[PDB]
Design a protein around this ligand. Structure first.
Ligand SMILES: O=P(O)(O)O[C@H]1[C@H](O)[C@@H](OP(=O)(O)O)[C@H](OP(=O)(O)O)[C@@H](OP(=O)(O)O)[C@H]1O
Ligand SMILES: O=P(O)(O)O[C@H]1[C@H](O)[C@@H](OP(=O)(O)O)[C@H](OP(=O)(O)O)[C@@H](OP(=O)(O)O)[C@H]1O
Lengths: 397, 397
């Protein structure tokens, strides 16, 4: 420090000295706080000693640990029964909030089972799901950041209805934590699945079309209840996913986040006739789990419509045409597939196909079509869920 | 030895040693916290000294301190006027939140006056009460722990309506901080008063029936909107209160938490007739601030009903019967007490009593009855408040 002249008199107080004193006081306060923390720890230890009182002073094993361990295993076998066991035996309190804290901690818990339980339509489960999402702190996180945390805590159920409940809870929570970002919960929900599809698109090699940042901006046009979201916001989300894929717990490689494919496609194919086996070039549109085909790209009405429900694909070698596969019903051998087409006179009639043999222009287009068709068939209930949700997202005047 | 009344034993039955140690540790922690607060205050003073605006002063106390001191005294005289003085003179900002912070700090404030002010039905006061409970951090505290903090910050008003507002604010805050614990705010509210009655029961010597942990579990059956709360939860609450009574600020010994008696009782008594002074044994039920008496325990209809409104008790010596007291109206000497009874023919008529002389089977039963009756009369508006609240608690499925 050095000293000051001090001609003035004994009342002269020195700011530096006062500051130093203040610092010392602060240090003392910190020490006191540390002491308090230590005391708290001691108290906790005492409580532990008290609890499991009827025992031998030195016991080999831990009552609490043993009982909780068995309860967790019970939960993994049947979540309803596990929760019940833990509540009955006072290892867990009975409120939705306490159950949610148990699930969020998730120690020794199967995260798929967590997802199965949180996605149930029961009133208790609904309340646990709310408290569960409330344990996720979404304020000041972008949508991908929030999704990363949420998707670490459980594994998405397979049932479309269950996936919906959980993503609705997520979207509602995000919007409450980040007001003014999205115009509606519906916007947040649909954008969330856009992000999930992008994760699949960019990180699964079975997906050839790798969307650019500009492309992802264009795909989400009108999502904000008719309006567009800020380009900067969409870019940040795109770049986060591009940089790092969703990290999934207990990952089996089969997760929706990695295998959420676009079920829609358009393009030229040759198709073999039903009763009369002639090859025809047609413009095909795969949409709504149906294969629509047209004589010309300018036709308003399809030449035919093939519902894909209950069908599967097999590759075939054809004597004349390259890159062939067949659609067929594996349950109904030798039976006509339910479909409709238009005759030359304009009459709409039933198709006469036991199989639909299709030839693609290239091996690469063959693979694209088979992927799209398989994806469309395999996740239809889920794509239907999103489609019904997207309609309410789009607003008509 | 020998003492006059039957309520002084020896200290032999102690509590559990570990628990006592924990309590001591908690006390130490509290002391440390107080020390830290003092240090902080000192630091603030040092900062003020360092600061430029602070001149050397001829005066013992400074402008801010002097003005705030007078304002606090004004508040204690008339809370509305005190707040106004502090706001007008820029010693306190005008929002409910700032006023609530002033009240919560409570420096040099009468905590009874704090309670009077927070319990007012005015719109501003209602908003201050909300902000006041928001300054209490109830997350991860059990209901007793939260009650201890809340009941340190102010003294409960005497008006039933005011008590209701404050306990409603408390219960709502607790449930928001601890979601899923109680099924309703009503559950939290009624359980809170169960805890308060237990405090009186276990810690006031005028109360002979000391409920066990099992007893307290049984008393709260169906409280959770028809359902039962977890036995472990109720045990923790019971043991906390048993171990340590509610610590009340500026304690005069007259606080509700110490003098919240059960106003209800049943049992055998002899009663002296009205016009014709014959002694009859009757089964008595004290409920709803009324004394109902029956010829037989199996009777559906009472022999008579004595409203206790406006009555008081005096002990008397009787020539024939032991352990006697009289109910009488001190305002209406020599006048018949409003009551009803049934004649032998079944006609319901008015009673002819100037006084009701009652004889109890033992001195101990006499004391129990007089306590119950006095308690019932003295706090009727409040018991009525709880009763109307408990009805909405009991719901049908
Ligand atoms: O045009 P020609 O050479 O006469 O042969 C037709 C076309 O291949 C039709 O295809 P498209 O409808 O695309 O024109 C086909 O109908 P499908 O669409 O049902 O395959 C007819 O099947 P049958 O009606 O089953 O013979 C087949 O007779
Ligand atoms: O039975 P007997 O010996 O004839 O005397 C009766 C009983 O004592 C009654 O008590 P209870 O009603 O409990 O049977 C009492 O009524 P109260 O209930 O009003 O005390 C009558 O009072 P009067 O009616 O005031 O005389 C008194 O006449």
């Amino acid at each position: 420090m050095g000293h000051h002249h001090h001609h003035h008199g004994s009342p002269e107080d020195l700011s530096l000295e006062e500051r130093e004193e203040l610092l010392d006081i602060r240090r003392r306060k910190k020490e006191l706080i540390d002491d308090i923390e230590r005391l708290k720890y001691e108290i906790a230890e005492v409580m532990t000693e008290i609890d499991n009182l009827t025992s031998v002073e030195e016991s080999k094993y831990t009552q609490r640990n043993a009982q909780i361990a068995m309860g967790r295993k019970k939960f993994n076998m049947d979540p309803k029964k596990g929760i019940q066991f833990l509540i009955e035996n006072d290892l867990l309190q009975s409120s939705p909030e306490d159950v949610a804290q148990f699930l969020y901690k998730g120690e020794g818990l199967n995260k798929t089972v967590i997802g199965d339980y949180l996605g149930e339509r029961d009133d208790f489960n609904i309340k646990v799901l709310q408290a569960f999402v409330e344990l996720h702190e979404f304020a000041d996180l972008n949508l991908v950041q929030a999704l990363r945390q949420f998707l670490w805590s459980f594994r998405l159920p397979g049932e479309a209805q269950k996936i919906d409940r959980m993503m609705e809870a997520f979207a509602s929570r995000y919007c409450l934590c980040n007001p003014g970002v999205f115009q509606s919960t519906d916007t947040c929900y649909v954008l969330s699945f856009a992000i999930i599809m992008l994760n699949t698109s960019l990180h699964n090699h079975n997906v050839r079309d790798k969307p650019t940042a500009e492309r992802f901006i264009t795909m989400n046009r009108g999502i904000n209840e008719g309006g567009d979201l800020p380009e900067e916001l969409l870019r940040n989300l795109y770049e986060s996913i591009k940089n790092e894929p969703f990290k999934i717990p207990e990952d089996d490689g089969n997760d929706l986040t990695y295998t959420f494919f676009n079920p829609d496609r358009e393009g030229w194919l040759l198709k073999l006739g039903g009763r009369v086996k002639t090859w025809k070039r047609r413009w095909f549109i795969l949409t709504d789990n149906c294969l629509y085909y047209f004589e010309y790209t300018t036709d308003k009405e399809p030449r035919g419509i093939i519902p894909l429900e209950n069908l599967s694909i097999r590759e075939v070698e054809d004597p004349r045409k390259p890159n062939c596969f067949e659609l067929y019903n594996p349950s109904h051998k030798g039976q006509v597939i339910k479909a409709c087409k238009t005759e030359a006179d304009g009459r709409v009639v039933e198709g006469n196909h036991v199989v639909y043999r299709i030839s693609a222009p290239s091996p690469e287009e063959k693979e694209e079509w088979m992927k799209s068709i398989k994806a469309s068939i395999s996740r239809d209930p889920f794509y239907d869920m999103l489609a019904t949700r997207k309609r309410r997202i789009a607003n008509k005047k």
